[PDB]
């Protein structure tokens, strides 16, 4: 009976009615930091790619024979 | 002076086109070398960025 009561208490306090909703906020912060790093990486990549693309266009369009 | 140089160029082209052909060949070789170098630099940068993305997408 004690084991079953402890199990039911852990069940109801685990995810049934736990007032601790800060886990959602922590997940929000983690995922937002992840997507911000991803966006920054993509932006740096596109900037480098654009620089290289302009440097390549300058040699492609101005060379024909 | 520029017009004198251009007149010399005319007389040289009408008197010796082999020099013009050699100069064109040299210019084409230089352009090919520059294009190869630019392509190699772009490939190096692209591979570096690929490794960067592969290391950063660990999530």
Swiss-Prot record, chain A:
Origin: domain of life: Eukaryota
Region forming the signal peptide: none
Subcellular location: Nucleus
Coiled coil feature spans: 19-48
Function: Component of the Mediator complex, a coactivator involved in the regulated transcription of nearly all RNA polymerase II-dependent genes. Mediator functions as a bridge to convey information from gene-specific regulatory proteins to the basal RNA polymerase II transcription machinery. Mediator is recruited to promoters by direct interactions with regulatory proteins and serves as a scaffold for the assembly of a functional preinitiation complex with RNA polymerase II and the general transcription factors.
Family under the similarity heading: Belongs to the Mediator complex subunit 22 family.
Subunit details: Component of the Mediator complex, which is composed of MED1, MED4, MED6, MED7, MED8, MED9, MED10, MED11, MED12, MED13, MED13L, MED14, MED15, MED16, MED17, MED18, MED19, MED20, MED21, MED22, MED23, MED24, MED25, MED26, MED27, MED29, MED30, MED31, CCNC, CDK8 and CDC2L6/CDK11. The MED12, MED13, CCNC and CDK8 subunits form a distinct module termed the CDK8 module. Mediator containing the CDK8 module is less active than Mediator lacking this module in supporting transcriptional activation.
Record's protein name: Mediator of RNA polymerase II transcription subunit 22
Organism from which the protein derives: Mus musculus (Mouse)
Gene designation: Med22
Residue range from the parent sequence: 75 to 139 of 200
Curated annotation (Swiss-Prot), chain B:
Domain of life: Eukaryota
Species per Swiss-Prot/TrEMBL record: Mus musculus
UniProt subcellular location: Nucleus; Cytoplasm; Membrane
Coiled coil start-end: 19-55
Family: Belongs to the Mediator complex subunit 28 family.
Quaternary structure (record): Component of the Mediator complex, which is composed of MED1, MED4, MED6, MED7, MED8, MED9, MED10, MED11, MED12, MED13, MED13L, MED14, MED15, MED16, MED17, MED18, MED19, MED20, MED21, MED22, MED23, MED24, MED25, MED26, MED27, MED29, MED30, MED31, CCNC, CDK8 and CDC2L6/CDK11. The MED12, MED13, CCNC and CDK8 subunits form a distinct module termed the CDK8 module. Mediator containing the CDK8 module is less active than Mediator lacking this module in supporting transcriptional activation.
Protein name: Mediator of RNA polymerase II transcription subunit 28
Function: Component of the Mediator complex, a coactivator involved in the regulated transcription of nearly all RNA polymerase II-dependent genes. Mediator functions as a bridge to convey information from gene-specific regulatory proteins to the basal RNA polymerase II transcription machinery. Mediator is recruited to promoters by direct interactions with regulatory proteins and serves as a scaffold for the assembly of a functional preinitiation complex with RNA polymerase II and the general transcription factors.
């Amino acid at each position: 009976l004690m084991k079953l009561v402890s199990d039911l208490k852990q069940f109801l306090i685990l995810n049934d009615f736990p007032s601790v909703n800060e886990a959602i906020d922590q997940r929000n912060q983690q995922l937002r930091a992840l997507q911000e790093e991803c966006d920054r990486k993509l932006i740096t990549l596109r900037d480098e790619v654009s620089i290289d693309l302009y440097e390549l266009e300058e040699e492609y369009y101005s060379s024909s024979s | 002076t520029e017009c004198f140089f251009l007149q010399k160029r005319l007389q040289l082209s009408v008197q010796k086109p082999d020099q013009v052909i050699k100069e064109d060949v040299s210019e084409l070789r230089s352009e090919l070398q520059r294009k190869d170098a630019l392509v190699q630099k772009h490939l190096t940068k692209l591979r570096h960025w690929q490794q960067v993305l592969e290391d950063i997408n660990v999530q």
